[PDB]
Scaffold this active site. Sequence first.
Site, PDB file in Angstrom:
ATOM      1  N   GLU A 116      -0.964   3.823  -3.683  1.00 33.60           N
ATOM      2  CA  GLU A 116      -0.165   4.195  -4.469  1.00 33.60           C
ATOM      3  C   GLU A 116       1.271   4.723  -4.589  1.00 33.60           C
ATOM      4  O   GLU A 116       1.985   4.162  -5.113  1.00 33.60           O
ATOM      5  CB  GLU A 116      -0.944   5.426  -5.175  1.00 33.60           C
ATOM      6  CG  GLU A 116      -2.174   5.164  -5.685  1.00 33.60           C
ATOM      7  CD  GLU A 116      -2.465   4.185  -7.033  1.00 33.60           C
ATOM      8  OE1 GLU A 116      -1.392   4.304  -7.761  1.00 33.60           O
ATOM      9  OE2 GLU A 116      -3.520   3.512  -7.168  1.00 33.60           O
ATOM     10  N   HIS A 150     -13.504  -9.810 -15.343  1.00 30.11           N
ATOM     11  CA  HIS A 150     -12.282 -10.442 -15.673  1.00 30.11           C
ATOM     12  C   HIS A 150     -12.531 -11.699 -16.719  1.00 30.11           C
ATOM     13  O   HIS A 150     -11.558 -11.885 -17.854  1.00 30.11           O
ATOM     14  CB  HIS A 150     -11.595 -11.180 -14.486  1.00 30.11           C
ATOM     15  CG  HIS A 150     -11.312  -9.864 -13.427  1.00 30.11           C
ATOM     16  ND1 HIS A 150     -12.267  -9.252 -12.940  1.00 30.11           N
ATOM     17  CD2 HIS A 150     -10.237  -9.563 -13.153  1.00 30.11           C
ATOM     18  CE1 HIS A 150     -11.486  -8.150 -12.156  1.00 30.11           C
ATOM     19  NE2 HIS A 150     -10.253  -8.509 -12.144  1.00 30.11           N
TER      20      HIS A 150
END
EC number: 3.4.17.23
Lengths: 595, 50
Positions: free
Chosen positions: A357, A487
């Site tokens: 992150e 997906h």
Amino acid sequence: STIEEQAKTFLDKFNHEAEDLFYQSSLASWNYNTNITEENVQNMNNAGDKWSAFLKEQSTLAQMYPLQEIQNLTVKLQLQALQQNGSSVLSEDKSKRLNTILNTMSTIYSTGKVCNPDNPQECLLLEPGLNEIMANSLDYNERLWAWESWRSEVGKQLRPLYEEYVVLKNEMARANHYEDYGDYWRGDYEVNGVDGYDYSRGQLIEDVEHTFEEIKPLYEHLHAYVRAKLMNAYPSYISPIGCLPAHLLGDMWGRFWTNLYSLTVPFGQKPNIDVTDAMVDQAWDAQRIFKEAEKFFVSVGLPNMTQGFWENSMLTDPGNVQKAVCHPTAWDLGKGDFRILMCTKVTMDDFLTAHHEMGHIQYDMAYAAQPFLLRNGANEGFHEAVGEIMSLSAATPKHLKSIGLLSPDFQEDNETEINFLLKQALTIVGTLPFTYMLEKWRWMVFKGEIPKDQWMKKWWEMKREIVGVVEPVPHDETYCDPASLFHVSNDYSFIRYYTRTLYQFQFQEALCQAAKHEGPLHKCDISNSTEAGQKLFNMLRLGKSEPWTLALENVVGAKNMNVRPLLNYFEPLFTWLKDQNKNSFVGWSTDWSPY
Amino acid sequence: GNYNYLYRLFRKSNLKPFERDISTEIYQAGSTPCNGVEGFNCYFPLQSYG
């Protein structure tokens, strides 16, 4: 007078009018994710609707400006990114039908149901259900039963709708002067205008095939090793000539094989590299993790953080006092407000996730001095690869020993290195053939190379030829098998992960070579350097201002997508696999079946 | 968010040293005449800050 000045003025006005709306939408999404109420989600939906309406209006206003008389490359790219028609090419009825189809597919995929017989309900959810059922089991019958039941329950409700979905997708693709939907997806990597560094749409498929041709030996060796381990474990469920079973992959879709490392570990009697005890004994918390991450990033060469990053980020899980989703996401508000939303705890996995992150935040801040249409990654694979390379480099035991986690007294045996290489290959190399097969199947079903009545017929044979996995039970055409993933059922690209995987090894090799380091790559360090950090910062600040073909050589040197860094990284593991699979058979046949 | 501040973003000419003007005429980049509102090549000079 000229058109270039008018285009630049319109683009500047659009940026100045859209930055505030983007900041408001980001703030609304943050307030929603940090406080689950009704007013927050209402404001978030209102901001999203206003942003969508403004973007549609600006696109309709920009479509009047031509694209041929634009001599500036950046202005041309911003116009191409702003004049995107999207779903507006279809009629209103077709658009609302496609939206309803997307919504009902999302709801069906999110609800989830098992409903096992012989019991009153036995109807669990997806993640607390099938995931832990197929991830923490040691039996052959229950996994097969769960896989078959889930696939049938998905097919019997997604088969009649998938045909209309792909028809609408092909219509929307052909309405925008594209030959197919796969071409519409591959057009993101297409670059024009600049001579000498162009990249055609059809060259991507050739490059992917050329990389897969060289990845094939490593995948075959890994498949042979997994088959040998399964024969040593289960002597009556796997043959030395057939392929691997479908329900024994440790995953519903067979993408990640992380659950297979616990059963196929060569040196399980030896300890692991877990430093959780060292962190819980030295009184570590969520703040010290981010402090050490910032120290690492500033020693590499990345700048410091802002004053609002440490006062707005939620580094502590509030618990039952308030509802808050614990999902690591690097939020970019666009106006200098960078903050991480993650419930970081004392865990090595949480440490690597926080490093990822922070790398994403640094990558976002790299091109912060760019217009709104340029504050984004070049492609859909670099934005995540830049964050994953930092985690892959920080996973070395020498870095944890230098920071203070690992004790200085630590052995450097090759067993731990082989175990780490196998664990990385089971989660990185194991998904590449499946990703390639899924992407090729979607491309050929969106182009028209696959007959409508042969979707599953082609899918179940590409699952055996390309991938070394065979189904334990034949399925008819009424079961919508290929649309069982997340997906494909939500219209998200799948080749982005493959591109990220092929680029992260190149980035790691470049950062290791630029740090004046020599020897093995699996233990190469990147911190405490001044050339690698500068070389990385000179490339991360480019963004959409330069094509990816020209930006790739500025950090690595190559002008195309290569796989040699992956081979150089897995050579210590490839030689070990060759030495272990020398006595066993290598390869699989599509004739044998576990039926 | 503070939106009480505005600034000039586009104009036909630049500003001289130590010059202050409160003219708020609409900018016209193209040859199309502007009647008083925005459009293709008509824009507003003042823009609210954030």
